[PDB]
Amino acid sequence: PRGIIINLDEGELCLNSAQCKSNCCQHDTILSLSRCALKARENSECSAFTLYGVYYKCPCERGLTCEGDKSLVGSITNTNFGICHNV
Amino acid sequence: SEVCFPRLGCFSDDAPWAGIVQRPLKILPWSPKDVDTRFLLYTNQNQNNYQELVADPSTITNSNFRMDRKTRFIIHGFIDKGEEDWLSNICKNLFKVESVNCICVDWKGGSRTGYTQASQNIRIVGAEVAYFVEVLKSSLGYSPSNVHVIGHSLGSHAAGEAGRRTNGTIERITGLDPAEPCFQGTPELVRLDPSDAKFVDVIHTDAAPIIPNLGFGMSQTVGHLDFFPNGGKQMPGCQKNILSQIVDIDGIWEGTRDFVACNHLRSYKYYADSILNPDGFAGFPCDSYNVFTANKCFPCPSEGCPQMGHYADRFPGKTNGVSQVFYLNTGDASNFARWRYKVSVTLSGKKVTGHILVSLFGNEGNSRQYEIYKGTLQPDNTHSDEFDSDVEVGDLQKVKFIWYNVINPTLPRVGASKITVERNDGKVYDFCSQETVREEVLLTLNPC
Amino acid sequence: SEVCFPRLGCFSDDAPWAGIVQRPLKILPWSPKDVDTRFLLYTNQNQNNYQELVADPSTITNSNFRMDRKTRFIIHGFIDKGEEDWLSNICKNLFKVESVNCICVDWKGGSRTGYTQASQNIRIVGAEVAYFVEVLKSSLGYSPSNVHVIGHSLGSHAAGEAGRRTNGTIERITGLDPAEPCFQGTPELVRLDPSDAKFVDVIHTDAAPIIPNLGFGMSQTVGHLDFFPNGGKQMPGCQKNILSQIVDIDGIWEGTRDFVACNHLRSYKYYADSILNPDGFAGFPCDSYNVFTANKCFPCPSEGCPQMGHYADRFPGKTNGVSQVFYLNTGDASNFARWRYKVSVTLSGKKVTGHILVSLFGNEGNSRQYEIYKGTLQPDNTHSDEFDSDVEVGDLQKVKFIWYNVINPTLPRVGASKITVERNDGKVYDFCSQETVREEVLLTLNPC
Ligand SMILES: *[C@@H]1O[C@H](CO)[C@@H](O[C@@H]2O[C@H](CO)[C@@H](O[C@@H]3O[C@H](CO[C@H]4O[C@H](CO)[C@@H](O)[C@H](O)[C@@H]4O)[C@@H](O)[C@H](O[C@H]4O[C@H](CO)[C@@H](O)[C@H](O)[C@@H]4O)[C@@H]3O)[C@H](O)[C@H]2NC(C)=O)[C@H](O)[C@H]1NC(C)=O
Ligand SMILES: *[C@H]1O[C@H](CO)[C@@H](O[C@@H]2O[C@H](CO)[C@@H](O[C@@H]3O[C@H](CO[C@H]4O[C@H](CO)[C@@H](O)[C@H](O)[C@@H]4O)[C@@H](O)[C@H](O[C@H]4O[C@H](CO)[C@@H](O)[C@H](O)[C@@H]4O)[C@@H]3O)[C@H](O)[C@H]2NC(C)=O)[C@H](O)[C@H]1NC(C)=O
Ligand SMILES: CCCCCCCCOCCOCCOCCOCCO
Ligand SMILES: CCCCCCCCOCCOCCOCCOCCO
Ligand SMILES: [Ca+2]
Ligand SMILES: [Ca+2]
Numbered sequence: 001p002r003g004i005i006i007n008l009d010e011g012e013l014c015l016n017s018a019q020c021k022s023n024c025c026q027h028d029t030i031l032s033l034s035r036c037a038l039k040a041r042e043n044s045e046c047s048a049f050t051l052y053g054v055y056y057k058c059p060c061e062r063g064l065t066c067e068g069d070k071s072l073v074g075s076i077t078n079t080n081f082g083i084c085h086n087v
Numbered sequence: 088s089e090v091c092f093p094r095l096g097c098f099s100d101d102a103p104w105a106g107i108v109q110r111p112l113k114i115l116p117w118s119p120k121d122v123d124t125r126f127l128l129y130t131n132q133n134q135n136n137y138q139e140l141v142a143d144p145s146t147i148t149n150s151n152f153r154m155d156r157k158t159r160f161i162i163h164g165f166i167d168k169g170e171e172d173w174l175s176n177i178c179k180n181l182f183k184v185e186s187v188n189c190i191c192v193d194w195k196g197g198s199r200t201g202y203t204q205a206s207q208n209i210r211i212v213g214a215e216v217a218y219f220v221e222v223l224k225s226s227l228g229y230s231p232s233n234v235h236v237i238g239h240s241l242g243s244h245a246a247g248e249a250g251r252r253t254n255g256t257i258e259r260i261t262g263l264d265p266a267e268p269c270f271q272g273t274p275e276l277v278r279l280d281p282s283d284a285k286f287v288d289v290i291h292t293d294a295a296p297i298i299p300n301l302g303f304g305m306s307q308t309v310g311h312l313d314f315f316p317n318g319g320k321q322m323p324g325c326q327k328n329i330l331s332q333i334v335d336i337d338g339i340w341e342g343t344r345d346f347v348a349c350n351h352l353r354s355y356k357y358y359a360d361s362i363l364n365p366d367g368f369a370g371f372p373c374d375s376y377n378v379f380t381a382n383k384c385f386p387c388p389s390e391g392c393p394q395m396g397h398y399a400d401r402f403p404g405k406t407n408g409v410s411q412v413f414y415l416n417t418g419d420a421s422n423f424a425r426w427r428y429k430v431s432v433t434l435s436g437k438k439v440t441g442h443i444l445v446s447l448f449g450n451e452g453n454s455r456q457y458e459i460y461k462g463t464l465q466p467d468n469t470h471s472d473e474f475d476s477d478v479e480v481g482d483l484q485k486v487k488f489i490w491y492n493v494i495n496p497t498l499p500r501v502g503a504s505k506i507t508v509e510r511n512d513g514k515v516y517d518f519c520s521q522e523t524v525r526e527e528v529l530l531t532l533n534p535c
Numbered sequence: 536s537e538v539c540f541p542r543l544g545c546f547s548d549d550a551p552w553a554g555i556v557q558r559p560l561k562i563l564p565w566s567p568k569d570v571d572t573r574f575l576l577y578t579n580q581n582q583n584n585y586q587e588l589v590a591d592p593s594t595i596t597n598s599n600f601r602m603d604r605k606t607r608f609i610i611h612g613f614i615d616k617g618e619e620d621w622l623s624n625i626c627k628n629l630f631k632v633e634s635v636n637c638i639c640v641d642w643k644g645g646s647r648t649g650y651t652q653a654s655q656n657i658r659i660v661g662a663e664v665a666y667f668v669e670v671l672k673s674s675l676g677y678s679p680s681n682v683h684v685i686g687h688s689l690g691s692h693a694a695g696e697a698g699r700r701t702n703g704t705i706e707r708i709t710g711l712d713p714a715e716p717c718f719q720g721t722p723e724l725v726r727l728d729p730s731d732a733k734f735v736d737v738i739h740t741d742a743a744p745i746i747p748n749l750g751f752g753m754s755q756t757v758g759h760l761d762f763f764p765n766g767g768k769q770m771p772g773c774q775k776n777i778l779s780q781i782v783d784i785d786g787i788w789e790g791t792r793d794f795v796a797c798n799h800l801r802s803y804k805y806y807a808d809s810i811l812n813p814d815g816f817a818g819f820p821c822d823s824y825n826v827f828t829a830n831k832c833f834p835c836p837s838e839g840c841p842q843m844g845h846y847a848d849r850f851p852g853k854t855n856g857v858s859q860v861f862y863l864n865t866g867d868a869s870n871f872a873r874w875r876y877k878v879s880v881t882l883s884g885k886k887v888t889g890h891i892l893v894s895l896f897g898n899e900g901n902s903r904q905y906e907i908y909k910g911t912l913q914p915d916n917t918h919s920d921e922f923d924s925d926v927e928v929g930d931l932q933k934v935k936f937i938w939y940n941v942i943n944p945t946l947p948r949v950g951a952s953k954i955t956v957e958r959n960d961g962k963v964y965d966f967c968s969q970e971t972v973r974e975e976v977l978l979t980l981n982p983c
Contacts, residue, residue: 012331041455063489063529406855
């Protein structure tokens with residue numbers, strides 16, 4: 001979904017997390033469309049930093065650490081999914 | 088002028104039906120054949136595909152209609168038809184929570200004409216829905232008690248017709264953002280108003296004025312309880328760019344409807360969710376909305392907060408007046424349930440500039456990180472705010488604190504001696520630590 | 536146009552204050568010097584001769600005013616002044632029942648001008664009374680709770696001003712027959728209406744229309760409870776010949792006032808008595824007045840009857856709606872308290888033509904002889920009626936029966952096997968005899 005403008009609200013359209021205010025441009029599958037979403041919270045699913053710039057599950061709010069898969073398969077298939085956790 | 092039609096009696100174009108100044112033009116209702124009021128039945132026994140009733144007792148006695156249940160009518164409004172998914176949602180959600188007769192009310196024939204026209208036919212739509220209650224009551228036995236009629240825009244008024252003609256004996260009428268133009272003003276005998284049923288609870292999601300900011304909603308009170316979620320005038324989730332509003336996640340019909348009358352339409356949105364979140368819509372008496380956002384009137388009064396939407400009917404202080412207004416904040420998307428908590432933090436460490444930020448943990452679950460203050464952080468100042476958590480944490484066990492956006496190489500440290508959280512319940516929970524932490528670090532406080 | 540005056544702020548002659556069609560002419564309020572609103576204090580410590588307050592806290596703190604009591608304002612209306620005995624009666628009666636601050640409100644300067652004019656100054660009179668509550672509240676501490684404002688004709692509206700400006704926080708506003716012309720119609724923001732106080736109970740004693748039967752009273756509802764004693768339009772005791780109305784037993788001022796606006800004035804009459812008879816004014820929900828006289832809706836509903844007048848404030852189903860109308864019947868003179876009882880008699884003896892007639896006896900006292908039926912009396916027919924006894928008998932012990940106006944030399948005899956009396960309470964008392972009696976003879980029945 002085209003976006004092409006900066007500092008987007010949640011629910012707005014995004015090609016990439018750099019545009020979102022949240023700095024998470026999420027979308028539920030590979031074929032769905034990327035809309036800004038909110039950083040996951042403690043204890044909710046997350047992904048570690050993707051280069052693809054677009055998430056199936058967001059990065060966590062500050063102070064938290066996404067604790068789950070950080071494998072190779074994951075990094076290419078954009079599925080390094082972890083739960084957020086304190087330290 | 089006057090027309091009279093078979094079942095529905097006569098229809099004068101006399102004041103205050105027209106001529107009066109907020110309703111100038113003299114125009115009549117249409118034949119009860121053009122309106123073409125239809126009654127689309129849905130039950131637990133038959134979500135997904137509707138039955139169809141006319142007032143004919145045999146029809147409703149040979150149908151999935153059940154008079155050992157309870158009945159809810161859903162009347163659309165202008166430019167809409169009783170099939171449109173929003174009317175079915177409300178039946179679906181209702182079926183999750185409840186066993187019920189969920190009659191959607193189509194009058195798409197009547198509704199697609201001119202605005203003034205459409206606002207005129209509603210007397211017929213009112214009179215149809217009114218007549219149906221009649222035959223239920225007298226022919227079938229089904230007391231106008233058990234009826235609850237919900238209507239949106241023009242439809243709320245229709246429900247006011249049905250309510251009026253029924254000598255105000257229907258249990259409840261719900262006004263999902265009543266239509267302002269030629270109804271706001273206009274005597275009790277044109278608009279919805281608390282007289283039209285035993286309890287009339289209105290949700291105002293697009294008040295503030297047709298001129299010049301284009302609101303189709305009613306400033307005016309009406310009904311007993313009068314909720315103005317998000318302050319009534321500007322629903323959050325409706326200022327999106329054109330592209331994002333139209334291509335919205337429920338398909339490109341919904342986004343166009345929200346492109347056209349977003350704020351206006353949110354009324355049945357909020358109603359729909361509240362069916363499923365019985366506690367997510369608590370409303371707050373206040374002398375204003377600004378005074379509410381100015382954090383000057385929390386938690387809920389000793390009697391309770393009304394729940395906005397499906398559960399306003401269980402408020403105790405309910406019929407006990409007229410035009411009681413209440414404020415709550417709602418989500419921006421399609422779970423809209425929020426839960427207001429007040430949190431005050433007292434700071435340790437030393438003078439730093441930045442934001443504080445707290446997150447609640449409780450036996451139910453835990454919350455996002457809501458800001459609380461931002462500025463010169465510095466020790467011993469107590470700071471406060473209340474925020475609309477999108478998680479109901481329940482009974483608190485802990486909280487955490489976190490701050491950001493001023494560190495020299497110094498690596499300053501800031502902390503919280505005590506944070507007390509007050510639920511809308513009224514409870515205050517106390518949380519203490521003598522720790523400090525450096526920025527972007529999560530200090531948990533425990534109950535002192 | 537607009538004027539602004541020292542204490543009372545500004546005064547627009549803009550719609551809906553004028554220009555609007557039930558209130559066409561554009562006219563302003565008078566200087567707050569011409570109205571000359573005065574506040575005549577009366578207390579238990581000083582009936583008979585009044586103190587005088589202006590909003591000046593020292594004045595009211597150096598007066599017999601007492602803020603550990605409760606305050607009632609009495610605003611006259613058109614062509615009247617706050618001295619006129621009716622205002623003092625209400626303070627006197629009040630003092631019998633109650634310890635109270637009974638402020639009569641004179642605005643005789645404002646009231647003696649033109650009608651349209653006077654209806655205009657009331658905003659000032661409203662604004663004065665409103666300001667007074669203000670200083671009480673803020674300067675003195677005296678909560679607008681403890682205020683009850685009663686007003687007659689134009690005055691009721693004045694109270695609506697005071698109520699409005701006070702953000703509807705005064706405990707009660709009472710409308711002794713509000714003035715119709717240029718107020719019936721006119722938005723909430725001109726007339727009395729339930730918004731102007733926490734409880735607005737109206738007594739309609741001269742509704743039904745200025746054209747062409749000359750009623751100065753309001754058909755319109757207004758307020759929460761809406762009593763129409765004697766059906767609202769034609770107060771009994773007001774159809775006397777000219778001579779008897781003018782030379783009435785309270786002097787020849789009162790009879791002229793009653794000669795001028797009898798029905799209209801009865802409103803404060805009924806209010807005055809109801810202070811002293813706490814139970815003598817019970818009112819009855821009904822679909823009409825005709826249906827009430829048609830004896831189709833007695834006794835009192837399970838919640839209660841509102842007492843019309845001074846005690847409407849103790850109804851439970853009180854604020855629990857808006858425009859609840861009630862019917863009672865009242866006397867024709869100056870104790871107006873009545874007590875409705877329903878009596879059904881079943882006849883013995885044999886076919887005779889004539890009237891039956893029953894009289895109640897109870898631990899409190901006994902009643903006149905009220906008719907019950909009249910026509911072909913004949914045995915085994917049960918006949919009924921309800922009547923407005925001018926004595927509250929209390930708990931019945933016996934009744935008696937008597938009949939008249941057909942005897943041949945035959946000396947027929949007629950009697951009553953059973954009479955059951957139902958109080959407005961709901962109780963039914965049963966009374967039986969197998970006796971007959973001949974005409975003009977008192978058969979007592981006893982409780983079976
Ligand atoms: C009682 O009144 C208020 C309560 O806050 C105190 O402070 C402010 O007072 C003003 C006037 O100084 C308040 O506004 C009032 O509005 C009424 C009109 O209707 C609206 O009321 C609310 C808000 O819109 C809605 O819920 C409702 O649906 C209506 O839309 C009128 O009573 C007054 O307006 C008129 O007043 C003046 C002066 O008399 C007129 O001549 C004007 O032209 C106009 O006709 C009233 O002004 C204001 O908003 C209040 N502030 C706040 C923050 O809420 C008073 O000091 C207090 N006094 C007492 C005894 O308690
Ligand atoms: C509801 O009412 C009873 C059940 O007890 C049944 O029988 C009578 O019903 C009629 C009408 O059916 C009742 O009359 C109504 O009159 C009202 C007129 O406005 C006034 O309302 C009351 C009555 O005077 C006052 O206190 C108030 O301040 C006003 O002066 C209106 O609400 C109706 O008239 C208007 O609406 C119709 C209705 O469709 C319009 O089309 C008319 O032209 C007009 O605008 C209404 O007609 C009467 O009191 C009842 N009495 C009794 C003993 O029964 C009804 O059929 C019943 N139906 C149901 C479900 O309850
Ligand atoms: C403004 C764009 C061009 C004209 C649009 C007209 C048709 C809109 O219909 C699509 C569905 O709209 C749903 C909103 O309907 C209610 C609007 O109500 C206005 C008065 O309440
Ligand atoms: C300016 C000179 C006097 C005007 C002549 C009046 C003629 C009739 O008056 C009778 C006395 O007034 C009683 C009726 O009042 C009706 C309005 O409400 C008054 C309530 O206090
Ligand atoms: Ca209505
Ligand atoms: Ca008013």
